[PDB]
Amino acid sequence: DLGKKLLEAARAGQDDEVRILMANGADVNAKDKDGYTPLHLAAREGHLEIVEVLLKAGADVNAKDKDGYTPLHLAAREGHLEIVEVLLKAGADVNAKDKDGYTPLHLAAREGHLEIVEVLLKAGADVNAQDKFGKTPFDLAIDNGNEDIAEVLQKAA
């Protein structure tokens, strides 16, 4: 099965295996048990070249797992700036929400990624976005000692 192998190669960061699998008609939008697609794993593990290659294939940039996570959600969380930009240039939902109401701006502000916070704010990230707890990206930035990020958000808000 080319699907399962494309998922393994995508997360392990095996470019050539990815290019070969895809050449042999591997489903770029293949899903596993947890609802992950090769794009999710690549974005999460930070395999840039694997990400763009999949984006060219026509992979769904907005695909969601059983938690509501989009590739952009994982990229903002892990802190892969370059990957975040590529997803956004591909047409990623800058304001997508998971099961907890988290937007990419929420996770970035929570993890302390100031660079990504910026790019997201340029993409159209709603600073006033609220998770299912009523908290905003600004609230989380403060809850985690991320001051520099909180200042940028208070200015953007």
| Structural domains in the chain plus CATH codes | 1-157 (1.25.40.20)
Length of the chain: 157
- Please state how this structure was obtained: X-ray
Q: For residues 93 and 70, is the Cβ–Cβ distance under 8 A?
A: yes
Buried b (16+ CB within 10 A) or exposed e, 115-150: ebbbbbbebebbbebebeeebbbbbbbbeeebeebb
Q: For residues 137 and 127, is the Cβ–Cβ distance under 8 A?
A: yes
Buried b (16+ CB within 10 A) or exposed e, 12-24: ebbeebbeebbee
> To 10 degrees, what angle do helices 15-23 and 48-57 make?
10
Q: Which residue type sits at 7?
A: L
Q: For residues 17 and 5, is the Cβ–Cβ distance under 8 A?
A: yes
Residue 60: phi and psi, rounded to 5, are -70, 110
Residue 10: phi and psi, rounded to 5, are -70, -35
CA distance 139 to 62: 26
Report CA-CA distances (Å) from 13 to 41, 44, 86, 128: 9, 11, 17, 35
CA distance 49 to 113: 21
Q: How far is CA 96 from the centre of its chain?
A: 10
Other CB atoms within a 10 A radius of the CB of residue 110 amount to: 21
Resolution (angstroms) equals: 2.1
CA distance 147 to 153: 10
